[PDB]
Coordinates of C-alpha atoms in Angstrom, one line a residue:
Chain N
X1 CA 88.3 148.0 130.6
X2 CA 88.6 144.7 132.5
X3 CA 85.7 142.3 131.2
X4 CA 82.8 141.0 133.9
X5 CA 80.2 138.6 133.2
X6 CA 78.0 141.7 133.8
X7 CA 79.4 143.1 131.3
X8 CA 79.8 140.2 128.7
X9 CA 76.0 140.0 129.6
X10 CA 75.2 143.0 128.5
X11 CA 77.0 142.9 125.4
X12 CA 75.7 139.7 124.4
X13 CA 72.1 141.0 125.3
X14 CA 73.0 144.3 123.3
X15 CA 73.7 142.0 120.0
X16 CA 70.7 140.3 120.4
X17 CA 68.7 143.4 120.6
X18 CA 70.2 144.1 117.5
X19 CA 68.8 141.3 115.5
X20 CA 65.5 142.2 114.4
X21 CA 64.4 138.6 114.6
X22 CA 63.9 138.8 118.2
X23 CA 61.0 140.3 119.7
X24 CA 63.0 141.8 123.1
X25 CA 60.0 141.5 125.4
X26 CA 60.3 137.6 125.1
X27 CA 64.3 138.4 125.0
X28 CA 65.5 137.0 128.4
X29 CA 68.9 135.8 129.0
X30 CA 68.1 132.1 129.3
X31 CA 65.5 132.1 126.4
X32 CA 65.9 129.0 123.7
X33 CA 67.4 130.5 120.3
X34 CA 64.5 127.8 118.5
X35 CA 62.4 126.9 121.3
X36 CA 61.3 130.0 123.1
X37 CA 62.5 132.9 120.4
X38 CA 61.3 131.0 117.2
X39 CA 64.5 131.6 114.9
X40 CA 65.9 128.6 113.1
X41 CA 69.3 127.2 112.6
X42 CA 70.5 130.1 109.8
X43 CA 69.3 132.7 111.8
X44 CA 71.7 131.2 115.3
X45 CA 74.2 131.3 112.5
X46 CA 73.9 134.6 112.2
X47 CA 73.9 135.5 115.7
X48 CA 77.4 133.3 116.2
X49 CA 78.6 135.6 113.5
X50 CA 77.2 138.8 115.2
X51 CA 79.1 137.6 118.6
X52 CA 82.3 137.4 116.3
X53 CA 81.9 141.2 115.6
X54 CA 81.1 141.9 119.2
X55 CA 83.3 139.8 121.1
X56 CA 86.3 140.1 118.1
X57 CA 87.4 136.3 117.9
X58 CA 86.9 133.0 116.0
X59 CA 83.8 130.7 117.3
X60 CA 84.2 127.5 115.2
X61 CA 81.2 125.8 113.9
X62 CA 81.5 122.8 116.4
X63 CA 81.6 125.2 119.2
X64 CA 79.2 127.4 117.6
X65 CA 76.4 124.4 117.8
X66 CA 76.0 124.3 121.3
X67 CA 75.4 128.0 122.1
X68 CA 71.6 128.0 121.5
X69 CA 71.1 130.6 124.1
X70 CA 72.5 133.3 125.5
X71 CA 73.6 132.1 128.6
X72 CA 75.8 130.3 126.8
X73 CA 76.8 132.7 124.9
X74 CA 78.1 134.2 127.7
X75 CA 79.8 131.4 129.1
X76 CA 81.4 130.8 126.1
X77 CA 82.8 134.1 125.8
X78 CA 83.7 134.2 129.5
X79 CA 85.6 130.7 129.2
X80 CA 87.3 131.6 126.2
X81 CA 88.3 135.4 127.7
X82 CA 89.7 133.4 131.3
X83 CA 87.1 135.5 133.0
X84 CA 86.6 133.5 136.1
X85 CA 85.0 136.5 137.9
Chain S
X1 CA 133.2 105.2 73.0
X2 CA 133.1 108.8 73.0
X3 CA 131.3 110.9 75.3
X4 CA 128.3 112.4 73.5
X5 CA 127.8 116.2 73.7
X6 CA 123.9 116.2 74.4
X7 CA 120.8 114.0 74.1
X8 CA 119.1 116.0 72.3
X9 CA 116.2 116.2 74.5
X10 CA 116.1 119.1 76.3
X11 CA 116.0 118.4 79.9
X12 CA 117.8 115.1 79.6
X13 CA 121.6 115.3 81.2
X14 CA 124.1 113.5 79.1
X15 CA 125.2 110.2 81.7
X16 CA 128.6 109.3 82.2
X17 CA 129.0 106.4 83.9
X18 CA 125.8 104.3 81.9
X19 CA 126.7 101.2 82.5
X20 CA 126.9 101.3 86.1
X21 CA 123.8 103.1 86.6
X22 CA 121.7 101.0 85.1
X23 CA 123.1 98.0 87.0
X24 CA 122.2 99.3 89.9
X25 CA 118.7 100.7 89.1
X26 CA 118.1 97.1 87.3
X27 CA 119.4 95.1 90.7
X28 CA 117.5 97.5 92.3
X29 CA 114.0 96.7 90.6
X30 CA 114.8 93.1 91.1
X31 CA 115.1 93.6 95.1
X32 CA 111.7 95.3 95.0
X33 CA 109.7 92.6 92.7
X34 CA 110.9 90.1 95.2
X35 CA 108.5 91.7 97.5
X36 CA 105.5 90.9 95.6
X37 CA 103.6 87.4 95.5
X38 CA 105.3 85.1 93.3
X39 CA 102.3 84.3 91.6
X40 CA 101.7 87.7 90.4
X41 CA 102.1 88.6 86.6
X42 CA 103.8 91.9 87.4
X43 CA 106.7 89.8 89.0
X44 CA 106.6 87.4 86.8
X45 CA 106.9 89.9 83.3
X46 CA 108.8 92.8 84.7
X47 CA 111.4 90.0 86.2
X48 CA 111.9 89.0 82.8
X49 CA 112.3 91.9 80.7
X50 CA 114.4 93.3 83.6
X51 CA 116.8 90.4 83.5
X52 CA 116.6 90.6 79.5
X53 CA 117.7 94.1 80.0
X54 CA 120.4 93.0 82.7
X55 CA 122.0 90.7 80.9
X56 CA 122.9 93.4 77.5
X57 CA 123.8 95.3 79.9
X58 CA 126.5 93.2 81.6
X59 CA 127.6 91.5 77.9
X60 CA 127.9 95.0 75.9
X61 CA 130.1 97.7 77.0
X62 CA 130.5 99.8 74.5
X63 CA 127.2 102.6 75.2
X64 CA 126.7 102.8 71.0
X65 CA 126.2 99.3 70.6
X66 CA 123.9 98.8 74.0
X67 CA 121.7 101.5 72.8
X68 CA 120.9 98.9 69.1
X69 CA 119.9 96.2 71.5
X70 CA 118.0 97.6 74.1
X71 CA 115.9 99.5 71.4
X72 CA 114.7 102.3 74.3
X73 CA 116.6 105.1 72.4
X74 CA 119.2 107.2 74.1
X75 CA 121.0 105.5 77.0
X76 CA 119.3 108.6 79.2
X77 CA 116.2 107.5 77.9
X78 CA 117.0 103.9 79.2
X79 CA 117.9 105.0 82.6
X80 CA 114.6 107.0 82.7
X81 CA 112.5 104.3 81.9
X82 CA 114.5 102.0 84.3
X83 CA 113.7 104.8 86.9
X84 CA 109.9 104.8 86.3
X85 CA 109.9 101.0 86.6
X86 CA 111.2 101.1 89.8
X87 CA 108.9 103.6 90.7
X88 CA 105.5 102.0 89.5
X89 CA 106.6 98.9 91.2
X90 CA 106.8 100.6 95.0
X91 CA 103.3 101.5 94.3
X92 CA 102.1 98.1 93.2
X93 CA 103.1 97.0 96.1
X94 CA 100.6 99.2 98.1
X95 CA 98.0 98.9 95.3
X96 CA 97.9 94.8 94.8
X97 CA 96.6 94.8 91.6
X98 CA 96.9 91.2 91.0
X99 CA 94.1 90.2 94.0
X100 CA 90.8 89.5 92.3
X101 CA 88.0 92.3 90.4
X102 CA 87.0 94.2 93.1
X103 CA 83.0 94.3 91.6
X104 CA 81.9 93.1 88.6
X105 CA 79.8 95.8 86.4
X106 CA 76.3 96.5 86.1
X107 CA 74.7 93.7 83.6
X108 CA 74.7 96.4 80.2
X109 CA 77.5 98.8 81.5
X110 CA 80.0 97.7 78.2
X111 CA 76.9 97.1 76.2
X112 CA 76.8 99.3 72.6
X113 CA 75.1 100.3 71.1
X114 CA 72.3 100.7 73.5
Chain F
X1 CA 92.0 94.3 46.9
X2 CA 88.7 95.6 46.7
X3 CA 89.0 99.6 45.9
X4 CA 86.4 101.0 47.7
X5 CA 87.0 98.5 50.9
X6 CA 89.1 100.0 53.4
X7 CA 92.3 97.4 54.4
X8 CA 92.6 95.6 57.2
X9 CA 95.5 95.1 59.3
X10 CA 95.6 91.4 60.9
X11 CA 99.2 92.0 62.5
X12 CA 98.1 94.7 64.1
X13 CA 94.7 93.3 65.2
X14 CA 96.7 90.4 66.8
X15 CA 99.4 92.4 68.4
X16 CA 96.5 94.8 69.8
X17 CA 94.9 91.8 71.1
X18 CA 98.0 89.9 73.0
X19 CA 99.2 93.1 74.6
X20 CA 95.5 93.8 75.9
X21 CA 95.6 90.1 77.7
X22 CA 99.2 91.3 79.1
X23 CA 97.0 94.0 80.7
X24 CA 94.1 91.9 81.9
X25 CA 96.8 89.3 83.5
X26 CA 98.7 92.2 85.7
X27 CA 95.8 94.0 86.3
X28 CA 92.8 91.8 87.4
X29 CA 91.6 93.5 90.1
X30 CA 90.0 96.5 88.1
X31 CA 90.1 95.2 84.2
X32 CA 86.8 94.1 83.5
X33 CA 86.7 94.0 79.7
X34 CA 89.1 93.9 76.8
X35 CA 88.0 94.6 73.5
X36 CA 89.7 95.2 70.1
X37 CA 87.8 96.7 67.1
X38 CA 87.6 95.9 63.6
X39 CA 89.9 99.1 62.5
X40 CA 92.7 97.9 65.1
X41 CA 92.0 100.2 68.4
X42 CA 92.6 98.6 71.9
X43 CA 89.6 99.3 74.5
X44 CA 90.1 98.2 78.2
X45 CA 87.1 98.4 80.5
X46 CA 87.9 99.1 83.9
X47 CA 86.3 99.6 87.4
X48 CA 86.4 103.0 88.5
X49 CA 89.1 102.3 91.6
X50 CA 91.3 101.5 88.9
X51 CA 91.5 104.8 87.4
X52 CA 95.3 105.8 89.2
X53 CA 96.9 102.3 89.0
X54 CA 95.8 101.5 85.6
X55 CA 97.0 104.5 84.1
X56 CA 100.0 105.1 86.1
X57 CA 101.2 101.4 84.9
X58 CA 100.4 102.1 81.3
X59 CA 102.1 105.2 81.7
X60 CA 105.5 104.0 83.6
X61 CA 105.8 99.9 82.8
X62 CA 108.5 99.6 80.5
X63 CA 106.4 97.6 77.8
X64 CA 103.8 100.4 77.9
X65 CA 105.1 104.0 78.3
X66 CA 102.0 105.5 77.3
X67 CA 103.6 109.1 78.2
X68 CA 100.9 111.1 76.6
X69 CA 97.3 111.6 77.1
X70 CA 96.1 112.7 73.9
X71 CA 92.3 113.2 75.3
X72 CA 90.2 112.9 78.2
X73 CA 86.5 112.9 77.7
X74 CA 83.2 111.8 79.2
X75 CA 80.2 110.2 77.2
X76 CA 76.5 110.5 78.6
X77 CA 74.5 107.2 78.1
X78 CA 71.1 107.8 80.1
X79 CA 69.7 104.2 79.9
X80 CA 72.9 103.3 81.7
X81 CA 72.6 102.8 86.2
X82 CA 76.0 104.8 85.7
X83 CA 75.4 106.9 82.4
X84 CA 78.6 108.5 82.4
X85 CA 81.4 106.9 80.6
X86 CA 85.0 108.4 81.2
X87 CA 87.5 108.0 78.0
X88 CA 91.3 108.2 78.3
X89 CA 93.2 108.2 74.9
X90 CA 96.5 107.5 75.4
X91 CA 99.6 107.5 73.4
X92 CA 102.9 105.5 73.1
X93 CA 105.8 107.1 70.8
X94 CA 108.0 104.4 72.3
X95 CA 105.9 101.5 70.4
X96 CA 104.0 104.1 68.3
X97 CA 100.9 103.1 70.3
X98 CA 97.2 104.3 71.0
X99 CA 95.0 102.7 73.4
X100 CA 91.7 103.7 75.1
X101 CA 90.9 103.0 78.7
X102 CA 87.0 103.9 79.7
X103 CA 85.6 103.9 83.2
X104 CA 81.7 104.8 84.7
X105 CA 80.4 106.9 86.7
X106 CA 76.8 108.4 88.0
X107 CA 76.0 111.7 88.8
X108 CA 77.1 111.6 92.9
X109 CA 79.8 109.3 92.4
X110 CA 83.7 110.8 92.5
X111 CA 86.0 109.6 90.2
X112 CA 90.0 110.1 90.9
X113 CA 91.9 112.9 89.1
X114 CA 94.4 111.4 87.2
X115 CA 96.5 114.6 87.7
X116 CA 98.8 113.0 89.4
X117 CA 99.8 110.9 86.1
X118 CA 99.4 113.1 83.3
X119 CA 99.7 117.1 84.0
X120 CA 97.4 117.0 80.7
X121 CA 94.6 116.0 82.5
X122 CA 94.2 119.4 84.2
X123 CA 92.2 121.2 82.0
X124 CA 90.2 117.8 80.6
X125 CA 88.9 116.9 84.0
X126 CA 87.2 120.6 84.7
X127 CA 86.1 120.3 80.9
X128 CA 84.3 117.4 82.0
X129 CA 83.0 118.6 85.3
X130 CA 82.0 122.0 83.3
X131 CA 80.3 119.7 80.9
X132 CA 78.8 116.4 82.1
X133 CA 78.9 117.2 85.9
X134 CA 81.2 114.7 86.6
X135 CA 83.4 115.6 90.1
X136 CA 86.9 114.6 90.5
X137 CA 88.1 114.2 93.7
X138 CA 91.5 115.8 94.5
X139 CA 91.5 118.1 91.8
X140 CA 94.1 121.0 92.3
X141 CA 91.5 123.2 90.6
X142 CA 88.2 122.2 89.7
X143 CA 85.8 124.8 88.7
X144 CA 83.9 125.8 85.4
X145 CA 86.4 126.6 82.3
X146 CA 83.9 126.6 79.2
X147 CA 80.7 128.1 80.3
X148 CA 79.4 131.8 81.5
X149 CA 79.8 132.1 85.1
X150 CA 77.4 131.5 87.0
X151 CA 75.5 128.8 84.2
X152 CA 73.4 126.9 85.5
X153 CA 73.2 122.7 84.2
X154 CA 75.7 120.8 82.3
X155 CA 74.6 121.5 78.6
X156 CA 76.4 117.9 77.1
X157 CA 74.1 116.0 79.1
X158 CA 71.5 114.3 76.5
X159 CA 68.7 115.6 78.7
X160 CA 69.6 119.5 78.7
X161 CA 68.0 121.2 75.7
X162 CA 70.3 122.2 72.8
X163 CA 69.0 125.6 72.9
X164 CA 69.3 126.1 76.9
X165 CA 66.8 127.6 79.4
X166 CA 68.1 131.5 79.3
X167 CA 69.5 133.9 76.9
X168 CA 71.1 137.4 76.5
X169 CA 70.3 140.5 75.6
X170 CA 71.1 144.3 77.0
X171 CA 68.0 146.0 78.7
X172 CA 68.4 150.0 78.9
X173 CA 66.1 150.6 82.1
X174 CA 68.8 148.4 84.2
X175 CA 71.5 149.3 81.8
X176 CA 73.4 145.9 81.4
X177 CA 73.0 142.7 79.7
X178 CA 70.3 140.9 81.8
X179 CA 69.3 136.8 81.3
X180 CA 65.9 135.9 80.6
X181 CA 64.2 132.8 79.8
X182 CA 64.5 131.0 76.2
X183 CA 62.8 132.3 73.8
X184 CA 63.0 131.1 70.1
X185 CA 61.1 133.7 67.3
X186 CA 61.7 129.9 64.8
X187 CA 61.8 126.6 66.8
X188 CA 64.7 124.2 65.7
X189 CA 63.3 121.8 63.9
X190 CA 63.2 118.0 65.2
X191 CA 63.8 115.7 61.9
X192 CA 63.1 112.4 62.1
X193 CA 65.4 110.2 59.9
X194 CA 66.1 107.1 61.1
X195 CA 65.1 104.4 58.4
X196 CA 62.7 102.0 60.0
X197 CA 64.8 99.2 58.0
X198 CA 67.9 97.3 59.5
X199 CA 70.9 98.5 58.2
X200 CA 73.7 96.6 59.7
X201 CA 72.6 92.7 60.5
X202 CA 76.3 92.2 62.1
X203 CA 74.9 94.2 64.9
X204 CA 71.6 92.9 65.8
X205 CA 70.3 92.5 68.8
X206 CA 68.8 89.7 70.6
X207 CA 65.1 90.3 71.0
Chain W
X1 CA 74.0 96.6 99.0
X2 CA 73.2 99.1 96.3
X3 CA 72.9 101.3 98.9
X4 CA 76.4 101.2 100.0
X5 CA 78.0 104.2 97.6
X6 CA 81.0 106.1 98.0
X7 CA 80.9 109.4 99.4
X8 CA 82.2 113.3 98.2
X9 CA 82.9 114.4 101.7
X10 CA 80.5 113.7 103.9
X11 CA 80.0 110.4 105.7
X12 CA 76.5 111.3 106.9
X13 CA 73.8 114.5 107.1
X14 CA 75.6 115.7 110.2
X15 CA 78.7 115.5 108.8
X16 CA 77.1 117.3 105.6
X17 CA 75.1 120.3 107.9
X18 CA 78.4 121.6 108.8
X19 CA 79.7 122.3 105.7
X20 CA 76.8 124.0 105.0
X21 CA 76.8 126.3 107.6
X22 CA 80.7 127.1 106.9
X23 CA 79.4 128.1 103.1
X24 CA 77.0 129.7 104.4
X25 CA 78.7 132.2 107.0
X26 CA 81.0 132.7 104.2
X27 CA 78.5 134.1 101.8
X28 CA 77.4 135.9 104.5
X29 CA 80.7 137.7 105.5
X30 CA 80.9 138.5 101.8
X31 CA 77.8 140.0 100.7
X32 CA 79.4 143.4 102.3
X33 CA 82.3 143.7 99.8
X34 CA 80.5 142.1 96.8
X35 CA 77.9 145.7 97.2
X36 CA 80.9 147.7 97.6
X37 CA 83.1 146.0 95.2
X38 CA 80.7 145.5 92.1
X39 CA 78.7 148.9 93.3
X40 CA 75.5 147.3 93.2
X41 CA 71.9 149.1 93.8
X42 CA 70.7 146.3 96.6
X43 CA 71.0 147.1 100.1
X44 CA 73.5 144.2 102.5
X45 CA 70.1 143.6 103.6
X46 CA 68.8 142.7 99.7
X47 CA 72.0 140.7 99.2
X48 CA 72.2 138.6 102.6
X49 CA 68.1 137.6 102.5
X50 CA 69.1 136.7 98.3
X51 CA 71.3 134.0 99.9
X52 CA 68.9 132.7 102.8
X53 CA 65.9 132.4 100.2
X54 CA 68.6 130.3 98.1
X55 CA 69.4 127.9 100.6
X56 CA 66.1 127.6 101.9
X57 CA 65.2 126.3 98.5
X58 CA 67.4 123.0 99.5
X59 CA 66.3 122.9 103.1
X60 CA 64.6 119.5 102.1
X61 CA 67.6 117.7 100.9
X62 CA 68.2 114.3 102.9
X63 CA 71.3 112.6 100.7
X64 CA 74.2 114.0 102.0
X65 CA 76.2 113.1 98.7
X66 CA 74.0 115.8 97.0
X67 CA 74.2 118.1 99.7
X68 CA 77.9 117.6 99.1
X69 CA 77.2 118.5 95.5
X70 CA 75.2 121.5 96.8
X71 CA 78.2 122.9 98.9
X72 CA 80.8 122.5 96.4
X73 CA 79.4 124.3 93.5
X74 CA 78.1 126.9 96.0
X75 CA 81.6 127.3 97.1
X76 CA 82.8 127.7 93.3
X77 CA 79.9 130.4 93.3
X78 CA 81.4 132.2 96.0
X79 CA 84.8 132.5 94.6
X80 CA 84.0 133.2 91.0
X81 CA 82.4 136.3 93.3
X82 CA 85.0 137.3 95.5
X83 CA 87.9 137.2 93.1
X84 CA 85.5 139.3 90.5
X85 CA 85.4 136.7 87.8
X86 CA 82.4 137.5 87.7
X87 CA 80.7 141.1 86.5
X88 CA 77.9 142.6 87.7
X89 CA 75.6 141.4 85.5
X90 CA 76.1 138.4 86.7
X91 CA 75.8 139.2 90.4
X92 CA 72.6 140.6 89.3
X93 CA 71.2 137.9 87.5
X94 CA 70.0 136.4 91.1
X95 CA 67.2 139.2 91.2
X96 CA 65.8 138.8 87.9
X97 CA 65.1 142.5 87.5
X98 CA 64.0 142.2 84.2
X99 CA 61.6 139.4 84.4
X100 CA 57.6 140.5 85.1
X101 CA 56.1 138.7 87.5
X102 CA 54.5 135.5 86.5
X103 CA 50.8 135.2 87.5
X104 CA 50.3 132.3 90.1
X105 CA 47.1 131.4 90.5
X106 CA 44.9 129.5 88.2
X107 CA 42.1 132.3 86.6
X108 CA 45.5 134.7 86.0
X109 CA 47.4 131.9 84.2
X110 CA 44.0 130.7 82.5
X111 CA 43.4 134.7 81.2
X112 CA 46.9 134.6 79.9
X113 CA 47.9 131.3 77.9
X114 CA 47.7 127.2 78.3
X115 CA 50.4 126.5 80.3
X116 CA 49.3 124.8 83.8

């Protein structure tokens, strides 16, 4: 179907369930990748990679930097995708 | 002043007009060394063994006879190496190497045995 | 002459000598020693930014044409800042010709591949990386060529034991040949022979 | 001074990190193959936290010239695996299978030998 950032949302939430790094109760969508969930900068590596799979296109590393939660995950995807809704 | 067959060296196209080509390559190298400082010893040598090489070239014309006095085997061979000249002195043009050692080496660097 | 004294050859040892001023005066700006030897070989010393020029005007001037590179090797001096000296042998069949042209480098300093100038080169430079762990920067290929995949060090260093850390051997349980630290069932021997007498007094030292 | 050197590839630690990361998403993306393609007995799992533990061992590394170091022969690591150079004994020679474990602490090694 048509993508929403609902839907994006829960997709990017549903990857992140995933990882069994994250505990999901401390999961929220504007949690800190190092901060608030604890992982370091391998394991936000991995994650990139896991939105790859998901979302089914290239994040390069300079892009990949900045999305340390998963808000902007979802922007990301959204701004890449031209989902304005 | 036959046409030879073949060099010999395989690779190496027989040249039929010698003389002319290396004239030009020659006059050629001489345009480029102008562009380097006067001063320089690469001028100053290759300007001389090119004007050395010039000048047989402009008094002999038969290609047997050349080939005794420039001692740089076949006339091919010549034109090669009159080639590669021009060619090394385009790039030390970009590479300067007459400006001064660019750093000196540690104090025992050259120093054997240790 | 005497018959157990080998020759020498002053003609030589001259020519050797004015040709390597010829390359000090073009090249200043990276020759930073000339050197003949008693049995007539031509050294020159250069700085390691120096590596392409110097060899491509050997190879290409037209009172050098050093068209072959006969060898390529790396030396490893550990007293030295920069322990690793870089070789070049080259030949001339034009004016039946050897000379030698050595540069430095550490361990985390690139030098240049000298690819571009002699083809040969190829297979010396990854011997050397292989070897001494010496990188070359621009190399269309560099990667290990004489030791086991995956080997860890680079065994020609003076500092990596002769016998290794690992070895071989097929285990059944796994059912493959498995590495395993060194283990020696006779120790090499360590002689020590050097005489504690001077030999040479033409090489002595300051103190 | 003597600390002006010349580089590998890396101008600076930042510069440096992000090579690092590109190897490592590389190995990462491979690990998949390299179980199916040598048929090894380790899980993706076994394979991917093989490659974390080894760059963690370098995690302290400030000089980006040996970082640089670090990333290239990794990368000659990684192909000498993907274009099955090597065999799988030496993909398995990262788990030391065959090795017992080495006591640690000091009355086990003082039970055993002299060695500190």
């Amino acid at each position: 179907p048509p993508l929403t950032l609902e839907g994006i949302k829960d997709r990017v939430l549903y990857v992140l369930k995933l990882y069994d790094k994250i505990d999901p109760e401390k999961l929220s969508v504007n949690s800190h990748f190092m901060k608030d969930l604890g992982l370091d900068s391998l394991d936000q590596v991995e994650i990139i990679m896991a939105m790859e799979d998901e979302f089914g296109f290239e994040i390069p590393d300079i892009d990949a930097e900045k999305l340390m939660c998963p808000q902007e995950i979802v922007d990301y995807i959204a701004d890449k995708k031209d989902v304005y809704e | 002043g036959l046409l030879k067959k073949t060099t010999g060296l395989v690779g190496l196209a027989v040249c039929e007009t010698p003389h002319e080509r290396l004239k030009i390559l020659y006059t050629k190298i001489l345009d480029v060394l102008g562009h380097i400082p006067k001063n320089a010893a690469y001028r100053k040598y290759t300007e001389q063994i090119t004007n050395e090489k010039l000048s047989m070239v402009k008094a002999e014309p038969d290609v047997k006879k050349l080939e005794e006095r420039l001692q740089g085997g076949q006339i091919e061979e010549v034109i090669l190496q009159a080639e590669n000249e021009l060619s090394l002195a385009r790039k030390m043009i970009q590479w300067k190497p007459w400006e001064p050692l660019v750093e000196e080496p540690p104090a025992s660097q050259w120093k054997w045995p240790i | 002459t005497r018959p157990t004294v080998r020759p020498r050859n002053d003609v030589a040892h001259k020519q050797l000598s004015a040709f390597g001023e010829y390359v000090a005066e073009i090249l200043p700006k990276y020759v930073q020693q000339v050197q003949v030897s008693c049995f007539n070989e031509l050294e020159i010393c250069i700085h390691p930014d120096g590596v392409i020029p110097v060899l491509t005007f050997l190879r290409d001037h037209s009172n050098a044409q050093f068209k072959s590179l006969a060898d390529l090797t790396a030396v490893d001096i550990p007293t030295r800042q920069n322990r690793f000296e870089i070789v070049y042998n080259l030949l001339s069949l034009r004016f039946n010709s050897r000379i030698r042209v050595k540069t430095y480098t550490d361990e985390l300093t690139p030098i240049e591949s000298s690819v571009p100038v002699y083809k040969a080169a190829n297979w010396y430079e990854r011997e050397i990386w292989d070897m001494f762990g010496v990188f070359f920067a621009n190399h269309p290929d560099l990667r290990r060529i004489l030791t086991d995949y995956g080997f860890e060090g680079h065994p020609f260093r003076k500092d990596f034991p002769l016998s290794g850390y690992v070895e071989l051997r097929y285990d059944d349980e796994v059912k493959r040949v498995v590495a395993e630290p060194v283990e020696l069932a006779q120790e090499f021997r360590k002689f020590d022979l050097n005489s504690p007498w001077e030999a040479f007094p033409a090489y002595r030292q300051p103190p | 001074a003597s600390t002006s050197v010349k580089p590998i590839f890396s101008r600076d630690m930042n510069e440096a990190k992000r090579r690092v990361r590109e190897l490592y998403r590389a190995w990462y993306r491979e690990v998949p193959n390299t179980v199916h393609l040598f048929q090894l007995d380790i899980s993706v799992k076994q394979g991917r936290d093989k490659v974390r533990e080894m760059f963690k061992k370098n995690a302290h590394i400030t000089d980006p010239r040996v970082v640089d170091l670090l990333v290239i022969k990794g990368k000659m690591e990684l192909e000498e695996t993907i274009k099955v150079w090597k065999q799988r004994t030496h993909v398995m020679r990262f788990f030391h299978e065959t090795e017992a474990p080495r006591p640690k602490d000091f009355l086990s090694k003082f039970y055993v030998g002299h060695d500190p």
